[PDB]
Design an enzyme around this catalytic site. Structure first.
Site, PDB file in Angstrom:
ATOM      1  N   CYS B 164      30.455  25.229  39.618  1.00  0.00           N
ATOM      2  CA  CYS B 164      31.063  26.963  39.390  1.00  0.00           C
ATOM      3  C   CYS B 164      31.731  28.178  37.782  1.00  0.00           C
ATOM      4  CB  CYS B 164      31.911  27.770  39.982  1.00  0.00           C
ATOM      5  SG  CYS B 164      31.436  29.635  40.171  1.00  0.00           S
TER       6      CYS B 164
HETATM    7  N1  NMN Z   1      25.567  34.093  40.597  1.00  0.00           N
HETATM    8  C1  NMN Z   1      26.163  32.911  40.056  1.00  0.00           C
HETATM    9  O1  NMN Z   1      25.015  32.303  39.854  1.00  0.00           O
HETATM   10  C2  NMN Z   1      27.162  31.836  40.767  1.00  0.00           C
HETATM   11  C3  NMN Z   1      26.721  30.439  41.388  1.00  0.00           C
HETATM   12  C4  NMN Z   1      27.492  29.902  42.051  1.00  0.00           C
HETATM   13  C5  NMN Z   1      28.646  30.966  42.523  1.00  0.00           C
HETATM   14  N2  NMN Z   1      28.945  31.641  41.671  1.00  0.00           N
HETATM   15  C6  NMN Z   1      30.135  32.058  42.474  1.00  0.00           C
HETATM   16  O2  NMN Z   1      31.334  31.565  42.740  1.00  0.00           O
HETATM   17  C7  NMN Z   1      31.894  31.949  43.162  1.00  0.00           C
HETATM   18  C8  NMN Z   1      32.884  30.813  44.126  1.00  0.00           C
HETATM   19  O3  NMN Z   1      33.550  29.943  43.518  1.00  0.00           O
HETATM   20  P1  NMN Z   1      33.516  28.369  44.238  1.00  0.00           P
HETATM   21  O4  NMN Z   1      32.663  27.757  44.371  1.00  0.00           O
HETATM   22  O5  NMN Z   1      34.853  28.063  43.349  1.00  0.00           O
HETATM   23  O6  NMN Z   1      34.337  28.300  45.504  1.00  0.00           O
HETATM   24  C9  NMN Z   1      31.722  33.182  44.775  1.00  0.00           C
HETATM   25  O7  NMN Z   1      32.159  34.339  44.281  1.00  0.00           O
HETATM   26  C10 NMN Z   1      30.503  33.135  43.773  1.00  0.00           C
HETATM   27  O8  NMN Z   1      30.245  34.593  44.176  1.00  0.00           O
HETATM   28  C11 NMN Z   1      28.346  32.702  41.603  1.00  0.00           C
END
Ligand code: NMN
Ligand code: NMN
Ligand code: NMN
Ligand code: NMN
Ligand code: NMN
Ligand code: NMN
Ligand code: MN
Ligand code: MN
Lengths: 257, 247, 243, 249, 232, 260
Positions: B164
């Site tokens: 991430c």
């Molecule tokens: N929009 C994307 O491409 C995408 C993909 C994976 C995670 N995220 C973000 O990563 C965060 C999750 O964080 P963790 O995996 O560290 O728990 C979420 O806030 C999420 O919005 C965004």
């Protein structure tokens, strides 16, 4: 340079050598050298040599023989008595060099008697053609995938001399003792391990992240290595390759020690 | 449609494009797209681009570059300054969209200067504001179709876990800075070095809150003191472990 | 023999069979046979059969059906009622032989009605175990799979739920479901190799000894979840897995 | 076969001896002898001797001195150079006897100087016999329960509950003891006890420290591995190890 | 001190002595107030309590200077105890106190006294902290520090108690305490042993898993298990 | 020098004081003073005062009242409203001094109305133990001598230590912290701190117990979340951080800590 010209230079050296003897370890590097030598010169002009000794496991020798036969090469095992050299037997700090000297001396003997023009080894950035052609680790993996090479010994072994203090005399029995101890620990699910030999003390090095799981085997490991001949069976509190995983302040303290 | 049809059509789209630039993350999807481009058009007509930035680890960048190199592609690193965009700097919920926008805009620049006819990404059934193309999604590829074709082509290697963005470690509204980003990234890099590949260092100003999979917390105990003192030298005052575990 | 020799022994056997029915479990061995059968004979001459039954998990079945499609095979589900045989229902020590008999009898029926020349398994005599005919070892199965790009298969196999019951204990739909929900929950916590052995009101959990240290953090949740499944005492076997 | 009869014998032997010097360890046995001698003979007729040497910790010496003071006895420390005897220095299996012999020889010197009629020890029912030291508890047929019964009778509630051994136990037979390796072993054990492990041994094997802990505490010990490793290395060990057999394996 | 006044009224007493702090104070106060010749200490020997608990109590009562007398009860001769019914405790209490009254009638004791917190110590409003202060007060340093319960708690209701399964349970618990786990139960489920430990010690127990497994199997169990709920 | 000399010094100080009021916490130090005051001066000339307040647990107060009665002293409870002082209420860095000031003012008021010549406390090296050159080892040695077996074995501090400087103390945040600590002690951890960081609870445990804590992770997490915390965390340095480390990493945790 590109991989295509790094591969060029290497076919040129093989074509010029005509007939070669290849030191084959079973790793990706010797696999690529052996496969390229076979491809450029043909089966009848390459002989693959795998070394068998008391300082390496029979299992690695058997695996290396089967990997070289797989590539379709004519393979020859040769046996080295490293313990006849006093530097190796009494494990002087330069024991590594006299082992390599004896190793390469026997490959040159094999190469002189088979009409090969040179001995080739795997070394990257005797003739190390990969290293002459400026092959890096990324270049070896790229050409291995390019040639369809998927199989090679993924775990490179050391010399068992690693387990004895400098000045300690290696014997047929204490070597077998250390190797049986390590084989047993791996059977319990600890593939990265060392049993360091300190006469009547066994000092076990494990990755610190596995020290916690290990506790359940303390008594079984203690009694098993005692039947192997150790009187005291211990676990090194620094772990395997001590000091490598420490903070910046205690990595410069363990290293100054 | 049969898989051969989904593949066949994909080869048709590549043949028509002639020269392509590939956004390469190292995952199964971009690996499949890059491999089909190399197979259909040859190495001299494909350029793999891997993005480097403050919000992703050097380790993830090096792995992606080496994977594209291992597939026989000409690969090119490009560096993005995500923090120059206020949306990313202030960690708003749409910061992701402006990051993808900035990346795809830089991909189009790369494609213009190498003569590529299109930019390709790994999306499957901001990307269209830039005219980048998801060839897998045009050919109606699903996840099972992607693994089916990857196995068909002998692809065994790809980054199996997509990492991430570090913005994930800060609450929405917290301003991202070079120092707090570097602080979190060094801490996670140190923890992974101890043998914990899935780890999170969530930032709470002077408190670091470590998330580990509950099944590994027992294995962590031997590192408590070293992790405590190392993250304090990174600038944290209190180094803590979340009892709830990872996520 | 080299792996190339063993592979050739297998391409030759498949070429001679012309049309085959493959008992496909989703493991590494069945994946290799199914992929080699498809590669040598083509999709139209191979039928993948996945067994669905009460003594194996729905999860194992779903993965195998989708994996066979992902390998490009025509896959066919078949359902076996193992509990209809009294030896299996009352879990006598020879229940395994009647279970294997009912399984292989149904594969032979499938192969007879589609014109397959043999039934192939992953390893009865009415089936042909081509890997062992070609002298494949575990290391060879792995090598050829990597050679062909096979990356997906069920890495941990769950076997027959009957193994979790003492000999002489009658298997029922409820005690089977009880054991299967208990094991499903434990795997969900990150323990893919696990057994919940059934002792009426006692659950006896077998885990690989190297994982018991990591398990402690789940004691209370595992205790309360398996009690809601119907066990009164939830215990952990000190001998570990395969005790 | 009565406690009262066994005590009676004890006051009679003390009354007959008139003046005594008592080898005082701080345990229940020496505490009981010291208390009975004080009651029967008076403070001026009893001298408590506590041995100070390189093979026991300063904390153990100070504790015994203050315990003897707490009973109202005149106590005098004496220091023994055990390493001057080759049997002790080279840790032969009879080191205990030559150490005890040298101890009892010095007790007789002290007793000769102050006019004591005998040296008294704690022994209950070796080199003591050659030195003529008297086990009054053992002559009065005191068993362990008899010693506890009389201590309760006299209000004696305070004594060293754990008798420590000679540091020689941490060295292999044949290993030469030095001022530094002894100090090394004692500092290592003192550090481990400070982490909350009161029962511990650091066994000396030249460049290897081998720690013996009760197996039931090894799980909780993991959190200190790195700190114990680096601290015992700064004490002079090259390798710091944990015995998989546990304490007294 | 309601205590010394209560003893003087009894004149001669027999003391039910368990060896715990509560019983230790009663025997010591009874001996002091009434004299050695007018107090009789009884330690019960039976299959439901440990030999170690009994031996310590007999030797400790002698060490306090009391006349100590062992008495043996065959609890399994009572059908309620033999078949471990839920009211087995009450029928056990009957046999214990009935045999003490026989001894007290036969030695001229005016009553039997027990500890707790005719329990004269409990009548004097003694708390647990009061018992520790007075024992040190009288120089009492020795007593059985771990009181066991009846071994019957380790068997399910309805399970018939036998000399062998009791000994089996007793040896298993004796082994576990030797490894440094003083609070432990091995509950008996025929061929399954179910071990109860305080949850805070389960981590510390892991190093003994294999040895405990093989040791309890030689005691007759086929399966040796650990209860995930912990002790109680 | 010797214990008999230091103790002799105490009976001399008590005899000279004639009548005393003793600040009794229930710890070993105050227990020693209260018993010596009763022993030398008699029950009628010693008054034991136990402070009850919103920053200390009811259990600590009850134990001190029950222990002082068990030694035979006339005991008097007095209640202090520490939260009425703004320095304590808003947890300033000198809050300890205004709490001690308000405490000692009430002891002096009590002592004036009992005819006591001074108030005595438990401080060691009118702190008679500290004047008599009592160290920690001397108080333990003398306590065994007099038969003192019962006292608060783990002394808790004021709950203010669990809040960052500048955080306002309320009944709800106090009750939140104290309930969390009592729950943790209920699981077999008598030495624990639950430090309050708004929505984060940071638990301090003796490092020798942390491995044993893993079995309670989930129950502690969910219980303290129902207490109002959003995140329940464990401090990797533990309780009294840096005091058990090796030589070099104790002096580096010293400059880490003294950086704030
Ligand atoms: N929009 C994307 O491409 C995408 C993909 C994976 C995670 N995220 C973000 O990563 C965060 C999750 O964080 P963790 O995996 O560290 O728990 C979420 O806030 C999420 O919005 C965004
Ligand atoms: N001097 C060399 O070039 C050389 C080469 C190979 C191995 N080694 C020895 O291998 C040992 C490494 O030990 P381990 O890999 O078992 O930890 C070292 O002692 C090292 O000296 C040295
Ligand atoms: N007797 C046989 O030929 C045969 C065949 C297949 C499985 N089994 C059973 O499979 C079971 C395996 O038990 P696990 O649950 O431990 O894997 C055993 O009961 C074993 O007897 C037996
Ligand atoms: N021979 C004796 O009477 C005697 C006396 C004192 C100590 N020891 C030695 O003390 C050692 C035990 O000490 P540890 O507590 O370190 O195990 C034994 O080797 C024992 O031989 C022996
Ligand atoms: N029912 C009673 O009045 C009574 C009295 C004394 C002891 N007990 C026993 O004490 C036992 C305690 O069980 P544990 O083995 O968990 O300590 C109870 O199961 C109970 O059977 C019961
Ligand atoms: N004069 C002082 O510095 C003083 C005195 C008493 C209490 N305190 C406070 O008591 C706290 C103790 O904290 P904990 O016991 O909760 O760890 C100190 O950190 C300090 O904040 C300070
Ligand atoms: Mn683990
Ligand atoms: Mn523990």
């Amino acid at each position: 340079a590109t991989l295509a010209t790094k591969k060029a230079t290497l076919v040129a050296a093989l074509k010029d050598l005509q007939r070669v003897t290849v030191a084959f370890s079973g790793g990706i590097d010797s696999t690529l050298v052996l496969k390229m030598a076979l491809d450029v010169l043909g089966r009848d002009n390459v002989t693959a040599v795998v070394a068998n000794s008391e300082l390496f496991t029979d299992e690695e020798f058997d695996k290396a023989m089967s990997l070289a036969e797989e590539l379709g090469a004519n393979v020859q095992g040769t046996t080295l008595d490293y313990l006849s050299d006093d530097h190796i037997k009494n494990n002087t700090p330069d024991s590594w060099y006299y082992a390599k000297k004896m190793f390469y001396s026997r490959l040159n003997d094999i190469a002189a008697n088979n009409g090969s023009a040179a001995v080739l080894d795997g070394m990257i950035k005797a003739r190390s053609l990969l290293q002459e052609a400026d092959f890096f680790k990324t270049d070896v993996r790229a050409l291995a995938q390019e040639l369809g090479l998927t199989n090679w010994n993924k775990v490179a072994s050391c010399s068992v001399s690693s387990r004895f203090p400098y000045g300690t005399t290696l014997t047929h029995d204490n070597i077998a003792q250390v190797m049986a101890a390590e084989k047993y620990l791996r059977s319990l699910g600890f593939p990265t391990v060392r049993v360091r030999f300190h006469n009547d003390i066994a000092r076990i090095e494990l990755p610190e992240a596995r020290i916690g799981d290990f506790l359940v085997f303390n008594d079984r490991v203690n009694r098993q290595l005692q039947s192997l001949g150790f009187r005291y069976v211990t676990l090194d509190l620094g772990g395997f390759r001590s000091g490598r995983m420490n903070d910046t302040l205690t990595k410069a303290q363990l290293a100054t020690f």
